[PDB]
Structures are given as structure tokens and as C-alpha cells.
Design an enzyme around this catalytic site. Structure first.
Site, short mmCIF file in Angstrom:
data_model
loop_
_atom_site.label_atom_id
_atom_site.label_comp_id
_atom_site.label_asym_id
_atom_site.label_seq_id
_atom_site.Cartn_x
_atom_site.Cartn_y
_atom_site.Cartn_z
CB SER A 245 -8.81 1.62 5.32
OG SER A 245 -9.44 2.69 4.53
CE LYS B 263 -4.04 2.32 2.07
NZ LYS B 263 -5.37 2.05 2.71
CB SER C 257 -8.17 4.78 2.11
OG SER C 257 -7.06 3.74 3.28
#
Ligand SMILES: NC(=O)C[C@H](N)C(=O)O
Ligand SMILES: [Mg+2]
Lengths: 98, 485, 405
Positions: free
Chosen positions: B178, B79, B154
């Protein structure tokens, strides 16, 4: 009743540029979200202590042993404006525009 | 592509048996990306050159028959709010476009130590704020199970990359869901470990008090392995918990007969759609068919999860995102002629709409006159939320329910309505508020879109979490579906 | 018409590394060469609390007669500036490590006990050199451990303010946690002053005095400000909240801004630092790590070794000076004589030669002699004129130079 004033005051505290064209739009959204924030008002907190940390660890300290800084060149590598080994910034800190 | 679908475990063995060369493992990965990401768009910056070199080193070690690492020739997506030294880390924001870290995050340190192979950075919502990943300044990732749907947020890219057969594992961050919600949306396995279980050194912060890094994988087992590689305590993070035992695989395979499973009524509440609710209830019966004991319970403060969460997270964000002045790094406004302008312009031009929403809300909630009524109140409600769990945990081993109220929604369906966008965090925020570990595994599909089943655990007890998650996984999974997309 | 004033003092702790970062606390002349990702506020970095800084902060607080907290956490003081990169200074708001203490001072009148309301741990900011129409920023000093000491608003005159800074500086100096020199910035001070005419509770204008760089200088601004708003109160004056800069050359204070309200720093608990739980044992270790402070050291010079009232104050002005004096005492030097010798003579030698490093040039071992040679050996003083200087910056025994000369 989030006014035009409070909006512009928050933007200043947050250091965010805002236009009257935005300010109004923001006054409305800000408000909406706040009425989303009001939901907590139906929660009974009398006698409840604020939760700052989720864990219990205590006293985590570090020993006073230095570590040489990194090269000046490394510490400057990502900055867009730098003059003679230091971050360069405006300071014509005066009235129409500080 | 050959091994683009091998589980971490199978791939691992495939490497140690010398049936595959690390260099080829990598070739297969990038082939997959070249073929699939054009449509999925889960990846941001790739590290192909470096990845290829490290894999070449790995071949040597393979031949010299010295292969160390819990992960080894295992490709890994990461990420983009997790620092990778040398590799461009943008947080999917204009504010950081171009930014190259000069230090290494702790999980990457650990990940490299285990010899995993960094393939690249994954797309996400800007600064981890969102529920669909559509706020990305660079691209809009899509759901491998449906190209018209969102991959969640996210950590959308991390869920999508795994579901798309791009990497066997990926790292994500979870502040209020997320990691779990995107996983629920892409029918993949995602774990948000208990607070403190994984160091935050290198995690570009949003909410210091609520953030956490965790793994996403196509199966429960792989997930447990990856969590053992990134967990430990760290001198670089004062809040990293000193819990030495990190064997999370010790009980995968053990039965859950007698497992005391609490099913809070507020989780099958009114905001939960009909399909999601049907799947979880069936999921409960499956659990019953397996020995575990499942009974209704109540987590009454659940309803406050979203509101106290946003007040708290925003407030912290109103502070954690302040370092972005564009002076030392990041976007630096060219038209700024004053220091006020430099700050105000660099931040307004470098941040997207949603990010500025949070900051605005945060700064207000924290300001003079409003502090106690808006931020303080939230922190107290936070206590209420943890209390709920404390009570439930007195008589139960785990808590079950759906991960998200609904299946993935459509592209642009909610991108313009933060209020409906926010609501999707109904079942995930309480976990972060209480700091518990929580995990999502698939439990169905409605019109092809996967539904997530979530297991919330006691602090630091991810092993039980994996145990029950595995057992349920033997009865349902998408293991053979990914291969067909 | 009491002029009410309080003092905000910061002290630089002299530790090896910084407060929340391992960077060294002492830096060279090369800018931005004494930093790391933490000091530079890079995304994703975390604060790591310097253990000694805490020990020293609570060492200095006890020496200040404060109640030491049992539970103490850190908080973020939020503000934007090129010298504050995180845009927040990790400090303390509620639960400062130390509260409600005091120090006794002698101002022309007799004794007055001034209260010190708090003491908290902070981190220093970087330095911003103003060049051209731009500004240069050096983060070398950013992160240096500081401690904030705020007096109760018990001070009552620009002179009581000086006395305060002197005793405070003196006491902190004894704990060996700071050189506390204002010319070196290891001790800083801001003053707050306001006048309230008797009979009533309402105050006139209130001002924060900035740019006060010397004990002597705070008094100047304080007494000037005092007269400045003394006129305002009488003549017409417009009550207001303001910040004022002191002009070193002209001796006046200049209005640099008018507060619109109270500066909003959005203080809130620092989640990245776990709370501190200071136990008894811990408090003991640092309790015991405190010498005899100036006051009780001076009260020791009064009845025991019955020295005067002037003498006592100046000999206890610094720990080294006072140690020197007592080391030289048992040696064989007549208490008064050494007293008179250190009071003036050595003190004047130090100031005139700026030898502030009283520990490298002469020694109690060497000085002890000179006083005996003067005392009984060779007869009387004239000679001490130059035997002292040489003996101070050059040798080891002046009962070898009178001879070798
Ligand atoms: N992304 C999260 O962890 C939570 C919430 N959906 C947000 O955008 O803040
Ligand atoms: Mg301060």
C-alpha cells in the site's frame, strides 16, 4: 462447496448483517477467494514452524505505575448513544432479535 | 504555488536562508490544493486554519533565528488511517466518517516535534484494503500522470498528492504494498521500512503483523530525511524495534561499485507485463553501468505471496476491525433495536464491500474446522517466504525487481474484479511477509504511465537501500516531469 | 456414576495499573473515569504488558506447583460484547505461563491430591449494568489483570469443590497478589459437572454452572445440579451440552442456553506483544519471593510446636492470622493459649464485628500481654470477656484497662 449455512454462520461470528439476496452472492465470492486460498496447498510446509512474528525482540514489559484515566467527558465524546456517564446499549436480549 | 515543487531539502534551506516565510510556504500549498485537488482528489480533511496558525508561529521562530526540526516549515500530507489528534481521521470509511481522535499517533508526535506543518489527511482505500483507492467512501483519487488511471492503493492519496505538487512529503501505510505500489503508479519514491522501524501507535490497524508507516516523496533524498524523523522506538508499541542508529542519509552519494544485487527470476515472471519487464531489465543494465554486480537468483515461494498474504491479512483484519460496534465511536445504526442488530447493522452499513469481503474470509480462515488448513498453513508459507530471502541475503546485498506487474490500470477497470485486483500485489507482499524494508522509485513510462523499480533490503538496513536507490536515481527520474504534471 | 467436575477460577491481581494499559487498577465510583484510549479500544491503540502482573502470575503458579513456561506468548480470545470493546480479550491459549500443578485437600475421608491443569494471564472485562430495556456500560474495570486457573477434572463431589476453593484461595492469598474475596469479585468461579455411570465411558449431560458467587454457593449449585442430572440420567434424560445459571434465592440452576457445539473464539497469537522468554534467573527472583505456604506452614504446627489437627487448619487460613499467631508466640504467649485465643475468641470477634482488617486494630505486641496477664499474673479468664474487645478495637495493653477500670 461453501454452503448457504456456513455463510450465515460466518456472518454471525463476524457480526455482519446479511440478506438471502446477499448470502448467495457471498457464498459464491467467499468460494472464489478460497480457491484463491487453495494455491498455498502447493507449498511444502512439512517441518516448517508457523511464523507469528517477523522480528526477534523478546520480553518487552512495562512497569506497574498508574496514569490517571482521562476525563469521563473525553472518553464519551465520540459515542452516539450515552446515558449518564456510560455507553448506552440495547439488551432486550430475547428471541426474535437478541 | 511557487514552492509547490521544491523538494523537502531545497525548501528547507529556502526557509533557513529566510528567502521564504513559512506562512507563505503554507499559502502556496493551499493555493495548489485549491487549484489542483479538484481534479486529483487526493485530500480528505484539510487543517487549513491550524496549518496557518502554526506557520505564523514558525515565522516568529524564523525571525528569532531559532529554527529547530529536521523538517521545519515543511508542509506534510498524512494518510487518513494515521491518527491526528483533533483532526478528523476516517480511514476513508463511512464507519469513521466524523470521527475525531482524542489522542496523538506517535509519528505525528515525532513529526510535530520536528516542526513539520500538517496540511491535511489523504484519501485512501477503505481501511487500507485495495489496490486503486476506488473503494474510498468519499472520492476516487486519480493518477497525476493520467487522469483516466488509478493512483494505486491503498495509499493512493499519498502517492498522488506528492506527484501532483501538493506537498513535498506524505505518510502512507503498507500492509502488502500500500505504499510502494501507489508510488510505482504515480512515479514517486515510497519506502516501507523494515518491520519495527516505525511505531504503530496511531496506525489504525488492518494486520498488526504486516502493517507499517513510511514516507512518499518526489526523490530518494527527501524520503531518507522523512524516514529519520519518524523512525525510532516507542514505549507505546511493544513491537517497535530498539535500533538507535537512524541516520539513513549517511551513504546517499556513495557509489554502488561492487554492490551485490540479486535479481530473482520469479520477479520477471509470467505475470509481469511486457513493458514493465523491459523497463526493469534496462534498469538492471543501468545498475551494471554503475558498478553494482547483478545476477539472477530464485525466490521460489514468491508465487504464494498473494495467497498466504490474503489469508493472513484478512484473518488479522477479522479481529482488528472488530472493535467497530458503533458503541464507543464510529457509525452507530439508528434502526438497531437489539444488541445483535446494533452490532450487525452498524458494521454492515458502516463497512464497504471489499472490507466485508476480507472480514468474511478472515473469520472463516480462523474458524473451527478451518483454522489449521487455512490460517495455520498460511503462517507456515510465510516462513517459506522469509526463508527465501534469508538464503538470498547470505550472498547478496540487495534484491531488485519491479514494484508492480503492470503500469497503473484504468478507472473502474478492475474495481469490480477483486481477483484481478489482488494479482497486482505479486511483487510487494513477500516483503511484508518477511518483514523486510522495501523501496520503489520510478524507472520508466509506458504510454505515459510510470513503472516502478523496487529494492528489497536486509532487516533494518534502509541506508543501503537509499544508497543504491540514489545512485540509480542519478541515471533516471521524473524530477523534471512533475512540474509539467 | 462418578460426578465429574472441574472448576474455572479467575483471580484479580492487585497491581497499580492494568494488564495491558497504564490506567489504574483501582477505580472510584464515577463511571468511565478510569480509562484511556487503550481500555476504550480506540482505533490504532496497542497493548503494553504489565511486568509485575507477569511476576505475580508466575509467583502464584509456582505456589501452585506448576511447571513454569520458558516461552510464553499471549493470544486473542475473540468475541463480541459491550463489555469487551476490542472484541477480543488478550489471554493465553497454548503456552500458558503455568501448567500441571496441584494442591492437597482434606475432605471427609483423608487426603486427596487434585490437579490443576493450567494458569494463564488475561485482562478483565468492563461492567454492564442492566437498566430498563437498555444497558449501561462502564469500562472502568476493563483491562484489570486476571489469571485463569482451571482444575483438572479430578474433583469428585460438591464438597471436594468447596475444599478446593478454600485451599486455592488460601494459597493465592499467601502470595500477596490478590485479596481473593468473592464478595469483592477478586476471586470468581465457574463449575463444570457431568455424570458417567460406572462400567462405561459415556457421560450423561454436561453443564457449565454460572452465577456462583460464594464458596458456600458453589456447593449449593454443585450438589443441586448433581441431583438434577442424577434424575435425568435415571428417569429418561436427554444428553446435551449446556450452560446453567444458579438462582441464589431458590437454590436451583436454570437452563440459560443449549450449546450448538464448542464456542469458537478463534484463538491466535497476539502479534502486538512480543513473546516472553522466562529464564532461570527470572524464575529464581520470583521463586524466592514466596513465603512458607499453608500446607508446610501447618505441617510445621504439627510436630514442631505440636498443635492439634483442627487448630493447624484455621490458623493457617490466612497469612496475616498465621503471622499474627507466630509473632505473638515468641513474644511470650503460650502457643496453645494463643492458638485457642485466635481459633475462637479473636476469630469470632472478627466475624462478629467484621473486622477483617486484623492488622490495624489489635497487634501481636498488644495481644501478647493479655495472654500473660491471664496466664500467670492476675489469675483466671472470666475477665478476658471484655478486656479482649476493648483491647482489640481500642487500645494497646489490657494490663492498663483492668487497671484504668
Ligand atoms: N493494500 C495492501 O497493503 C495490500 C493489498 N493490496 C490489499 O488491499 O490488502
Ligand atoms: Mg477467562
Amino acid at each position: 462447496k461453501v454452503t448457504r449455512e456456513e455463510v450465515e454462520h460466518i456472518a454471525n461470528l463476524a457480526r455482519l448483517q446479511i440478506s438471502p439476496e446477499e448470502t448467495e452472492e457471498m457464498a459464491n465470492t467467499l468460494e472464489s477467494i478460497l480457491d484463491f486460498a487453495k494455491q498455498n496447498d502447493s507449498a511444502d510446509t512439512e517441518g516448517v514452524e508457523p511464523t507469528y512474528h517477523v522480528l526477534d525482540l523478546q520480553n518487552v514489559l512495562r512497569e506497574d505505575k498508574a496514569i490517571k484515566g482521562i476525563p469521563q467527558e473525553l472518553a464519551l465524546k465520540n459515542a452516539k448513544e450515552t446515558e449518564d456517564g456510560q455507553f448506552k446499549v440495547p439488551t432486550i436480549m430475547n428471541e426474535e432479535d437478541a | 504555488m511557487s514552492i509547490r515543487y521544491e523538494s523537502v531539502e531545497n525548501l528547507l534551506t529556502l526557509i533557513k536562508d529566510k528567502k521564504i516565510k513559512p506562512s507563505d510556504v503554507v499559502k502556496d500549498i493551499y493555493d495548489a490544493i485549491e487549484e489542483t485537488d479538484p481534479t486529483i482528489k487526493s485530500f480528505l480533511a484539510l487543517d487549513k486554519e491550524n496549518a496557518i496558525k502554526k506557520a505564523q508561529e514558525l515565522d516568529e521562530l524564523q525571525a528569532k533565528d531559532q529554527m529547530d526540526g529536521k523538517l521545519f516549515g515543511i508542509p506534510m500530507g498524512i494518510k487518513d488511517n494515521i491518527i491526528t489528534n483533533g483532526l478528523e481521521t476516517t480511514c476513508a470509511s463511512k464507519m469513521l466518517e466524523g470521527f475525531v481522535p482524542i489522542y496523538e499517533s506517535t509519528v505525528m508526535e515525532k513529526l510535530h516535534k520536528e516542526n513539520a506543518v500538517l496540511i491535511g489527511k489523504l484519501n485512501m482505500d477503505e481501511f487500507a484494503m485495495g489496490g486503486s483507492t476506488e473503494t474510498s467512501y468519499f472520492k476516487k483519487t486519480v493518477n497525476p500522470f493520467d487522469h483516466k488511471a488509478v493512483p494505486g492503493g491503498s495509499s493512493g492519496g499519498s502517492a498522488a498528492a506528492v506527484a501532483a505538487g501538493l506537498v513535498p512529503l506524505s505518510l502512507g501505510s503498507d500492509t502488502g504494498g500500500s505504499i510502494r505500489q501507489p508510488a510505482a503508479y504515480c512515479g514517486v519514491v515510497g519506502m516501507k521500512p523494515t518491520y519495527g522501524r516505525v511505531s504503530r501507535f496511531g496506525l489504525v490497524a488492518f494486520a498488526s503483523s504486516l502493517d507499517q508507516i513510511g514516507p512518499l516523496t518526489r526523490n530518494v533524498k527527501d524520503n531518507a530525511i522523512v524516514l529519520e524523523a519518524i523512525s525510532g522506538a516507542d514505549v507505546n508499541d511493544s513491537t517497535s524495534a530498539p535500533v538507535d542508529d537512524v541516520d539513513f542519509t549517511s551513504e546517499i552519494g556513495k557509489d554502488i561499485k561492487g554492490l551485490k544485487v540479486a535479481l530473482p527470476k520469479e520477479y520477471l515472471g509470467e505475470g509481469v507485463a511486457d513493458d514493465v519487464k523491459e523497463a526493469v531489465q534496462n534498469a538492471v543494465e543501468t545498475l551494471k553501468s554503475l558498478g553494482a554486480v547483478v545476477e539472477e537468483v530464485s525466490l521460489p515461494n514468491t508465487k504464494f505471496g498473494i495467497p498466504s498474504y490474503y489469508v493472513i491479512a484478512s484473518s488479522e483484519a477479522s479481529s482488528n476491525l472488530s472493535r467497530f460496534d458503533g458503541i464507543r465511536y464510529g457509525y452507530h445504526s439508528k434502526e438497531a433495536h437489539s444488541l445483535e442488530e446494533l452490532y450487525k447493522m452498524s458494521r454492515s452499513e458502516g463497512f464497504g464491500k471489499e472490507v466485508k469481503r476480507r472480514i468474511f474470509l478472515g473469520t472463516f480462515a480462523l474458524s473451527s474446522g478451518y483454522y489449521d488448513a487455512y490460517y495455520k498453513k498460511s503462517q507456515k508459507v510465510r516462513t517459506l517466504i522469509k526463508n527465501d530471502f534469508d538464503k538470498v541475503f547470505e550472498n547478496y546485498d540487495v534484491v531488485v525487481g519491479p514494484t508492480a506487474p503492470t503500469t497503473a490500470f484504468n478507472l473502474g477497470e478492475e474495481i469490480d474484479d477483486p481477483l484481478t485486483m489482488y494479482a497486482n500485489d505479486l511483487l510487494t507482499t513477500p516483503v511484508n511477509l518477511a518483514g523486510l524494508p522495501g523501496i520503489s522509485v520510478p524507472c520508466g513510462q509506458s504510454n505515459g504511465r510510470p513503472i516502478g523499480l523496487q529494492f528489497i533490503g536486509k532487516p533494518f538496513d534502509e541506508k543501503t537501500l537509499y544508497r543504491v536507490a540514489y545512485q540509480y536515481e542519478t541515471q533516471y527520474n521524473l524530477h523534471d516531469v512533475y512540474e509539467k504534471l | 456414576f462418578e460426578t465429574v467436575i472441574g472448576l474455572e477460577v479467575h483471580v484479580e491481581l492487585k497491581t497499580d495499573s492494568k494488564m495491558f494499559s497504564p490506567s489504574p487498577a483501582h477505580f472510584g465510583a464515577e463511571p468511565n473515569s478510569n480509562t484511556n484510549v487503550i481500555d476504550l479500544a480506540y482505533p490504532g491503540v496497542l497493548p503494553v504488558v504489565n511486568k509485575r502482573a507477569v511476576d505475580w502470575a508466575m509467583r502464584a503458579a509456582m505456589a501452585l506447583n506448576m511447571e513454569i513456561a520458558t516461552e510464553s506468548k499471549f493470544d486473542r480470545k475473540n468475541y463480541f460484547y459491550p463489555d469487551n470493546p476490542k472484541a477480543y480479550q488478550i489471554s493465553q491459549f497454548d503456552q500458558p505461563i503455568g501448567e500441571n500443578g496441584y494442591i492437597d485437600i482434606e475432605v471427609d475421608g483423608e487426603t486427596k491430591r487434585i490437579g490443576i491443569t493450567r494458569l494463564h494471564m488475561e485482562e478483565d472485562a468492563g461492567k454492564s449494568t442492566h437498566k430498563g430495556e437498555y444497558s449501561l456500560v462502564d469500562l472502568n474495570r476493563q483491562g484489570t489483570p486476571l489469571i485463569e486457573i482451571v482444575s483438572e477434572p479430578d474433583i469428585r463431589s460438591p464438597k471436594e469443590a468447596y475444599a478446593y476453593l478454600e485451599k486455592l484461595r488460601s494459597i493465592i492469598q499467601y502470595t500477596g497478589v490478590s485479596d481473593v474475596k468473592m464478595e469483592e469479585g477478586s476471586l470468581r468461579c465457574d463449575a463444570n459437572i457431568s455424570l458417567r455411570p460406572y462400567g462405561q465411558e459415556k457421560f450423561g449431560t454436561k453443564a457449565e454452572l454460572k452465577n456462583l458467587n460464594s464458596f458456600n454457593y458453589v456447593r449449593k449449585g454443585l450438589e443441586y445440579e448433581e441431583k438434577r442430572q442424577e434424575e435425568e440420567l435415571l428417569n429418561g434424560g436427554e444428553i446435551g451440552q449446556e450452560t446453567r445459571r444458579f438462582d441464589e434465592s431458590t437454590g436451583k440452576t436454570i437452563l440459560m442456553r443449549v450449546k450448538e457445539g464448542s464456542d469458537d473464539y478463534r484463538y491466535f497469537p497476539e502479534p502486538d506483544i512480543v513473546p516472553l522468554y522466562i529464564d532461570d534467573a527470572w524464575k529464581e527472583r520470583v521463586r524466592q519471593t514466596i513465603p512458607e505456604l499453608p500446607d508446610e506452614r501447618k505441617a510445621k504446627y504439627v510436630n514442631e510446636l505440636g498443635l492439634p489437627a483442627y487448630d493447624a487448619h484455621v490458623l493457617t487460613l490466612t497469612k496475616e492470622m498465621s503471622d499474627f499467631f507466630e509473632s505473638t508466640i515468641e513474644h511470650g504467649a503460650d502457643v496453645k493459649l494463643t492458638s485457642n485465643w485466635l481459633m475462637g475468641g479473636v476469630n469470632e470477634y472478627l466475624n462478629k464485628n467484621q473486622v477483617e482488617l486484623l492488622d490495624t486494630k489489635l497487634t501481636p505486641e498488644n495481644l501478647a500481654g493479655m495472654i500473660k496477664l491471664i496466664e500467670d499474673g492476675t489469675m483466671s479468664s472470666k475477665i478476658a470477656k471484655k478486656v479482649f474487645p476493648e483491647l482489640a478495637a481500642k487500645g494497646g495493653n489490657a494490663k492498663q484497662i483492668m487497671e484504668d477500670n
